[PDB]
């Protein structure tokens, strides 16, 4: 079990840790989150009481270092930082526990939600999408734009997701125009899986990371990217059996976890009706199809 202490909480903020969240009042003695399960990535995120715009947050993995939160009054936000002094950090942590000023990561033991949402997400891959190599954790917020969005401004703040585009030389082999555009199997397996991602797990990792960034920060480029990666798979006639079954599980827990009230901006009506009902893989997402119908029949 690991800890992320907080120096103080000077401004009223809603704090999230993975799918859990707590209201913290202006200068309430809050000093961190304890019992954070080792072994997966995590994300701690924020929404100021005063500015319900710009949700922001930090992806991290406690194995990669000791990390803490500190409000910066110049920049006006909670900053993640690394303490390099191992002794000094266990000291701050232990004293805060002693004084019991920390919330416990509230995991029910039956619950695999966070594992099912972050199965294939690796901190090393995240840091290639959010390039900022002087930190071991990554910042994301509501407003950050993706590399593909920028093509159609500031690259330091860019989400460097893999660019997918169905009407591109990359996607379409000369001479197989019609074939490749109606059956994207060659884009998926040769170009994307074998070529760029190397394996299905990194592909699935970026897919899940994209979804989480959309859910947690309402990042619109990430939503676009999640839909694109679903569509690419569902629009391929030839997909490894193991990918299809895992996709159904992945999407199931994504649809499951989404706030009921946000279904309108986070779910692209075309893509889902296409994947569930029109595409090659319509018959291959039984769990995802069942939970979508019983929970959002209107979108369909």
């Amino acid at each position: 079990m690991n800890t992320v202490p907080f120096t103080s909480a000077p401004i009223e903020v809603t704090i999230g840790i993975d799918q859990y969240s707590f209201n913290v009042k202006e200068n309430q003695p809050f000093h961190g989150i304890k019992d954070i399960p080792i072994g997966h990535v995590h994300v701690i995120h924020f929404q100021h009481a005063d500015n319900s715009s710009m949700r922001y947050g930090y992806w991290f993995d406690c194995r990669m270092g000791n990390f803490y939160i500190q409000y910066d009054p110049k920049d006006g936000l909670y900053k993640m930082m690394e303490e390099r002094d191992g002794a000094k950090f266990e000291n701050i942590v232990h004293n805060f526990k002693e004084r019991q000023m920390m919330v416990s990561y509230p995991k029910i033991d039956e619950d695999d939600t966070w594992y099912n949402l972050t199965e294939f997400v690796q901190m090393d891959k995240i840091r290639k999408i959010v390039r900022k190599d002087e930190n071991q954790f990554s910042y994301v917020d509501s407003s950050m734009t993706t590399v593909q969005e920028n093509e159609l401004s500031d690259p330091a703040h860019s989400l460097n997701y893999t660019v997918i585009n169905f009407k591109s030389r990359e996607a379409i082999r000369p001479g197989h125009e019609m074939e490749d555009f109606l059956d994207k199997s060659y884009y998926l397996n040769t170009v994307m899986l074998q070529g760029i991602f190397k394996n299905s797990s990194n592909y699935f990792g970026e897919l899940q990371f994209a979804f989480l960034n959309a859910m947690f920060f309402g990042n619109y480029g990430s939503s676009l990217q999640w839909h694109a990666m679903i569509e690419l798979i569902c629009s391929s006639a030839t997909v490894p059996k193991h990918m299809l079954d895992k996709l159904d599980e992945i999407l199931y827990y994504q649809i499951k976890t989404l706030p009921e009230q946000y279904s309108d901006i986070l779910l692209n009506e075309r893509v889902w009706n296409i994947c569930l009902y029109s595409s090659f893989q319509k018959n291959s997402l039984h769990n995802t199809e069942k939970i979508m119908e019983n929970k959002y029949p209107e979108l369909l």
């Binding site: 009407k167 591109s168 030389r169 379409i172 125009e177 019609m178 555009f181």
Partner: protein, 237 residues
């Protein structure tokens, strides 16, 4: 973006553009089989590729053999149209390649766009106009050359004959669309109007009779009256 009444004169400026109409690319007859099932038989078709400014028509004839052993032929026809349009563009010298290609049916956008990926600066556009280019096979000489063909064949025409020697593109195109619209609404009458007088002949290098300026005015009025009559009949107005 889309072509409509607002941006209509853009067709006559000096940016090269082409209309592509695919309505006569896959043509069938429908008949009954001995067992009583229905079957289609394909006949020869044509892509109608027209420069509205110059009248240069690029009639690509689609021989029935293209369909042999293929499924989802109406879907394939869109891709074969795009494949042949793109090859046409590739065949033209750079200075003659169009800056825009306007498809008369939106279903053609994705096929053409995918086939034109090598020409990113060629804009593919839909249109909101209800152009009558499907009636192109009502022009006897175009139908004849299509139906006679024994292989894939491109045939070049000037769809305006020699009109531009005396009228502007804008006016030429409005005559063409008006003639084709009449042929579409009531072919038999339309054709009667054009040929009633045996003394007005079609030159061998032309598609339409050699009317004098005054005679075109009478013709155009007769074609307008036709189109309006057929409307009241259609709708009981």
């Amino acid at each position: 973006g889309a072509m409509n009444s607002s941006n209509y004169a853009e067709l006559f400026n000096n940016d090269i553009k082409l209309f592509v109409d695919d309505t006569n690319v896959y043509r069938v007859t429908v008949h009954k089989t001995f067992e009583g099932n229905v079957a289609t038989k394909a006949i020869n078709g044509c892509i109608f590729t027209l420069n509205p400014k110059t009248g240069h028509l690029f009639l690509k004839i689609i021989h029935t053999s293209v369909w042999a052993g293929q499924k989802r032929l109406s879907q394939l026809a869109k891709w074969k149209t795009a494949e042949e349009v793109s090859a046409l563009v590739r065949s033209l010298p750079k200075e003659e390649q169009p800056k825009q290609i306007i498809v008369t049916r939106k279903a053609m956008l994705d096929p053409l766009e995918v086939h034109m990926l090598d020409f990113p600066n060629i804009a593919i556009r839909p249109t909101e106009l209800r152009l009558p280019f499907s009636a192109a096979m009502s022009i006897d000489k175009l139908s004849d050359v299509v139906m006679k063909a024994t292989e894939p064949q491109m045939v070049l025409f000037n769809i305006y004959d020699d009109w531009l020697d005396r009228i502007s593109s804008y006016t030429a195109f409005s005559r063409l669309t008006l003639l084709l619209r009449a042929l579409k609404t009531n072919e038999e009458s339309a054709k009667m109007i054009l040929l009633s007088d045996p003394t007005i002949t079609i030159k061998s290098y032309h598609l339409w009779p050699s009317f004098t300026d005054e005679q075109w005015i009478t013709i155009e009025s007769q074609m307008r009256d036709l189109i309006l009559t057929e409307y009241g009949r259609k709708y009981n107005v």
